């Protein structure tokens, strides 16, 4: 069943484990066409089975006999004289006399390897093509089968997504000419559904082939998408083997009836995250963009800065369609962003008029500005964080976009549930949710206090005023003030966080702009300093230079050099907006109302119970000391 895989390895290995030559690059090409034909279809599988039957083997054998007869002395010169072939072209062919070099150890390697591949491929051809093309040890076997099935299910779920990531860190690592027409088609792949998955994948196999031919790590990608097509075919084959429907079902098997997830631990565990479906997409993308803001810290990120603001201050059903525009407004930004990134791979001879528009300030400032607007500059070496961040947010947006296309939605907290008071997993989740509105939501605000800013004082005063009033507010259910209070919270801990994070990029670009706007004698910028002691200040990015005058001004200004919002602002915003779309409905309202009655209750009732029980304790300890004195005495 799997010695075809052992074969695979060998052909590729022999062709690829020595200096390249015509024989070697011809075999590589034949391997690539074999993989492409497998990608084309499974009747093409049957046809390639017919293939091995007639090819590569005869070409491997005739090449072996040709090199063997060439290895003889004397016949080399005779052939050279007859065919008028140059020695350099013969070396490019690969047909070189090894005895004249004296390296006898070279001969036996390619006298044992092609013969071994020949014999193993005949053994495979005459054996495998029949049956393969026709189609508490016991407890340990059952467990192994169960794990195999589970990992196969997870693979067919999430190998389609993996082929995107394993192909993008490669292009992110190395960028050249032979990658420009690839990535654009990549941008044309996820932006379209699976209906063209068979075609666009072929578009991959056609191009990464040619670039390899341009050479004279990529093979990891080749085996990656080959394995993707392999599991695509094998899942259908397995389904047809057991008389199962051939439809590609997104849901593997409803074990805990989705919403019956509560079931228990391993019971929820899965759809707990498997049906993450909604939770996943929405909240995690609002977090992917947030973590992307740190990875970028440039003006290109300022455009997407407000697109999340467009989502966070309106209901989901209110801006349902505009976000469909948003997911395509980034599906086309990645391609021309990369197009600019490359620009001219080896070199060229042409100028830039943006620099010409700019004149009379400083040379360092235009470099910093060009870095911030993120467009091309000759010879600048860029990191790979931006590409990965944009790639991850694009995938999350596309997933959530498929969610929205699957189904959408057509005066109060609409959604509601039922009670059973706790359940291990929920016991845990319910217990942490009861206190989540107090410490989990506000520890991030405490981090904001640690954020050492004047806007941090803005957090400070608000949270200090909120700690006294909101506690009594929630536990009493103010009539005709629930929605009013929650809108107050919206403007309070949701509006302020985004409102103070929106400048976190343009204030630093202001600090990075045309060198100086602050440093002379008398009386202007000591008060333009009192504000620049905390407003514009760090303008921090790990690529910049300064001149002497701004070097002295910064020496005078004494900036701490740590103000990036990654530490305390984004991880607070993300928690707040992970909460916003969840606690506005569901059990929250149930528990919120559970907070009011209990007041009257334990307020005037267990108080007398408590005084009474303390006197009761007194009585028992009293009697025990009486008894011990008696007994000591007795």
């Amino acid at each position: 069943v799997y010695f075809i895989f052992v074969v695979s390895v060998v052909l590729l290995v022999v062709s690829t484990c020595f200096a390249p030559n015509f024989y070697n690059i011809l075999f590589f090409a034949l391997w690539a066409l074999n993989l492409i034909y497998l990608k084309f279809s499974f009747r093409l599988y049957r046809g390639l089975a017919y293939a091995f039957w007639l090819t590569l083997t005869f070409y491997t054998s005739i090449v072996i006999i040709a090199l063997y007869i060439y290895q003889f002395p004397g016949v080399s010169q005779w052939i050279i004289r007859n065919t008028s072939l140059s020695q350099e072209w013969l070396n490019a062919i690969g047909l070189v006399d090894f005895r004249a070099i004296g390296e006898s150890g070279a001969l036996f390697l390619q006298l044992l390897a092609p013969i071994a591949l020949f014999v193993v491929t005949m053994l495979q051809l005459k054996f495998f093509h029949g049956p393969w093309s026709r189609a508490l040890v016991k407890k340990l076997h059952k467990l192994a089968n169960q794990t195999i099935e589970l990992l196969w299910r997870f693979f067919e779920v999430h190998i389609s997504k993996i082929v995107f990531v394993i192909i993008a860190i490669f292009i992110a690592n190395n960028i050249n000419a032979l990658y420009i027409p690839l990535v654009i088609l990549l941008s044309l792949a996820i932006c379209l559904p699976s209906a063209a998955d068979g075609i666009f994948s072929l578009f991959m196999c056609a191009y990464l082939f040619l670039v390899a031919l341009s050479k004279m790590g990529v093979i990891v990608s080749i085996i990656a998408l080959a394995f993707q097509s392999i599991v695509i075919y094998r899942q259908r084959h397995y389904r047809a083997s057991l008389g199962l429907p051939e439809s590609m079902r997104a849901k593997v098997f409803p074990d805990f009836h989705h919403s019956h997830f509560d079931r228990s631990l391993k019971n929820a565990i899965q759809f707990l995250i498997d049906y993450g479906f909604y939770k996943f997409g929405l909240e995690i993308t609002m977090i992917a963009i947030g973590i992307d803001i740190f990875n970028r810290m440039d003006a290109l990120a300022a455009i997407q800065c407000f697109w999340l603001v467009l989502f966070a201050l309106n209901k989901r059903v209110f801006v349902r369609r505009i976000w469909v525009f948003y997911v395509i407004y980034m599906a086309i930004l990645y391609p021309l962003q990369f197009f600019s990134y490359v620009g001219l791979p080896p070199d060229s001879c042409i100028e830039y008029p943006w620099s010409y528009w700019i004149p009379s300030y400083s040379d360092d400032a235009r470099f910093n500005l060009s870095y911030l607007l993120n467009l091309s500059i000759y010879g600048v070496n860029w990191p790979s964080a931006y590409l990965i961040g944009d790639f991850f947010v694009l995938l999350l947006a596309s997933c959530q976009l498929a969610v929205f296309r699957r189904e959408g939605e057509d005066e109060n907290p609409q959604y509601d549930f039922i009670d059973t008071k706790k359940s291990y997993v929920d016991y845990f989740k319910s217990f942490v949710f009861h206190y989540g509105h107090w410490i989990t939501l506000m520890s991030t605000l405490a981090a904001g206090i640690a954020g050492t800013s004047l806007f941090a004082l803005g957090y400070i005063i608000f949270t200090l005023t909120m700690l006294w009033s909101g506690n009594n507010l929630y536990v009493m259910n103010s009539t005709l003030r629930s929605f009013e209070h929650t809108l107050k919270r919206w403007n309070a801990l949701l509006g302020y966080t985004l409102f103070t994070i929106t400048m976190k990029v343009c204030l630093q670009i202001f600090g990075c702009v045309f060198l100086s706007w602050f440093d002379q004698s008398g009386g202007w910028g000591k008060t333009l300093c009192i504000v620049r002691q905390l407003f514009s200040i760090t303008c921090v990015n790990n690529e910049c230079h300064v001149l002497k005058e701004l070097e002295d001004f910064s020496k005078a200004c004494a900036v701490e050099t740590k103000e990036g919002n990654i530490g305390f602002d984004v991880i607070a915003l993300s928690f707040l907006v992970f909460q916003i779309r969840i606690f506005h409905s569901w059990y929250f309202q149930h528990c919120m109302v559970e907070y009011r009655s209990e007041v009257i209750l334990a307020n005037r009732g267990a108080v007398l119970k408590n005084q009474l029980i303390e006197k009761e304790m007194k009585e028992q300890n009293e009697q025990q000391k009486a008894k011990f004195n008696d007994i000591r005495r007795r």
Partner: protein, 48 residues
């Protein structure tokens, strides 16, 4: 007391100590650590 082998006036020590601190640059932290170590070493000896 003679010029050939003389002591160090507090003026020169103060000037050198002031010079030690200002050689850094705002961004680099290695300069911060270097100035810290150098001033700590220098201040361990009195003018005597």
């Amino acid at each position: 007391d003679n010029a050939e082998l003389g002591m160090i006036k507090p003026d020169q020590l103060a000037s050198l100590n002031q010079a030690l601190t200002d050689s850094y640059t705002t961004r680099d932290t290695n300069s911060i650590l270097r100035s810290r170590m150098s001033v700590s070493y220098l201040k361990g000896y009195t003018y005597e």
